[PDB]
Design a protein around this ligand. Structure first.
Ligand SMILES: *[C@@H]1O[C@H](CO)[C@@H](O)[C@H](O)[C@H]1NC(C)=O
Lengths: 48, 48, 48
């Protein structure tokens, strides 16, 4: 939902929330999303 | 045009067109995860 | 020292990056530690 959140406002609006205490099966990100671009400077998604 | 080759094989298919980035040696998504995968040490050309 | 790598302890680097990327980090660490060994050995020879 924070991805399904219709709140991506702007640059001088770049509210950032401390997401914490998740267990996110990041697979979701690179699997159940098809979220078009995924440049991941740093760690590889496979072991994310 | 100045080399002599061995075991040259081709591959043909049709894709939706946004996954034309997924035919690279090392990518993520349900085309290079479920359908077609290239080895990391690839030698050859992709033509689209 | 990380000799320009993103980290030092091999286990981590291995535990964060895919093999194709690992290549870069790994190689740099290798060169650094190899040079340290070489210097140590040469010094030992002289002192010998
Ligand atoms: C929320 O996003 C997902 C993809 O991330 C999409 O499948 C779904 O339809 C979206 N929900 C709504 C209400 O649009």
């Amino acid at each position: 939902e924070v991805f399904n959140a219709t709140r991506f406002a702007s640059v001088y609006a770049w509210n950032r929330k401390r997401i914490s205490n998740c267990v996110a099966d990041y697979s979701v990100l690179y699997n159940s999303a098809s979220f078009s671009t995924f440049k991941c400077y740093g760690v590889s998604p496979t072991k994310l | 045009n100045d080399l002599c080759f061995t075991n040259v094989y081709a591959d043909s298919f049709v894709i939706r067109g946004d996954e034309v980035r997924q035919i690279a040696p090392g990518q993520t998504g349900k085309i290079a995860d479920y359908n077609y995968k290239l080895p990391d040490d690839f030698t050859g050309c992709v033509i689209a | 020292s990380n000799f320009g790598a993103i980290s030092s302890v091999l286990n981590d680097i291995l535990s964060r990056l895919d093999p194709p990327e690992a290549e870069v980090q790994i190689d740099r660490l290798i060169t650094g530690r190899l040079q340290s060994l070489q210097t140590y050995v040469t010094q030992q020879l002289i002192r010998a």
